[model samples]
Target chain A: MKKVVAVVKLQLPAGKATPAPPVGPALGQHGANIMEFVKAFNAATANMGDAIVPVEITIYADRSFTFVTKTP
Target chain B: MWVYRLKGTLEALDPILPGLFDGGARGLWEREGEVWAFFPAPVDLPYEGVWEEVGDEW
Candidate 1:
């Protein structure tokens, strides 16, 4: 198990992620890789179409992270 | 070709990127303060904006 240092919650459109406000500021402050999250989020929700996807990102002390998509 | 112009930055229109690509966007470009999606032809897009016909050039 990883040491969870921070947990950030975001509601974004499925299959659409950009290093912009909300996402950038929220994650950059935690030393998370914004683009990596964007790519992962988009790829995971690609087939979900236009639905808004809720996500929870858990950042660890090593600057590494993992995320889970939630039902909306 | 045609250019679909949305009155917002790529970040502002983030939610619409998938739709644009799914709807047949050749590529996306950001200029000044607007986002422009290029397509081989004009298709009925699902977002607010305007379209202009352009020469067949990349």
Candidate 2:
């Protein structure tokens, strides 16, 4: 079946990643785990300096979601 | 979104948008292994087994 749940928009820094406040609650709504996200984000953007990374999170029905980044 | 910049590069995306020039990275994260990639658009990896990390906990 075609899969897609919610599209949550988040503006985050390249160097800094957290599961605090907004991130924690935001993902909680859709059952999207935070630790995995926080850890992975920091790892990927390790070298990109500091910039606002625009993200569009796609949550799935099973709650195993994914996301994409776009320029705005 | 036609014009794409080929400038700079990052590693190990599959772990989901860490922002989508690359993302939830695959391969090795931190330990650093080999064969890393970056994606510019919305992506889906239905194939999950050998190439991607499979585990209950780290």
Candidate 3:
């Protein structure tokens, strides 16, 4: 089983994720790839427009990650 | 001239943001558990939020 390293919660704008504050500081500190997460999140929520999206990111010991998108 | 305060965190105010911006909000600020949208003028908005008249744009 993959060991869970950390979990992060962030509220971001849909389809507009950037490697900026909140995103950068939150994921970078955990050693997770910030840009990849931003791309995935923006793509996943593109249709949602300007809604604020709540995301839960699960980081593994290997630095790989997975995310769960929640209701806005 | 006014600030519309939504009684929840950004996560909870997500669904209401699109409409809030559409209603002419100039910007937004979050304080405590509340999210405040600043507007230059009063607008007829579909979403429910507390509207307060402020003297200055601070």
State the lDDT of candidate 1 residue by residue for A26-70, as single tens digits.
577778898999899889888898665657788998888899986
Each model's iRMS: 12.9, 12.3, 9.3
Cα lDDT tens digits, model 1, B1-58, are: 6778888776688788778867866445555677667666789876767898765322
TM-scores for all candidates: the values are 0.53, 0.50, 0.58
- The better candidate by DockQ, 1 or 3, is 3
lDDT per residue for candidate 3 within A1-72, as digits (tens), equals 799997776656778777754566557777899899989999989899767776778899888999998766
Choose the strongest candidate by lDDT. Answer: 3
Task: Give the CAPRI class of candidate 2.
Answer: incorrect
What would the per-residue lDDT of candidate 2 be over residues A1-72, giving only the tens digit for each residue? Answer: 538776565555664667653355556677888888777766766567855565556778788767675432
Native contacts retained by candidate 3: 0.00
Clashes of each: 0, 8, 1
In model 3, the runs with Cα more than 4 Å from the true position are: B1-58
- Order the candidate numbers by TM-score, best to worst: 3, 1, 2
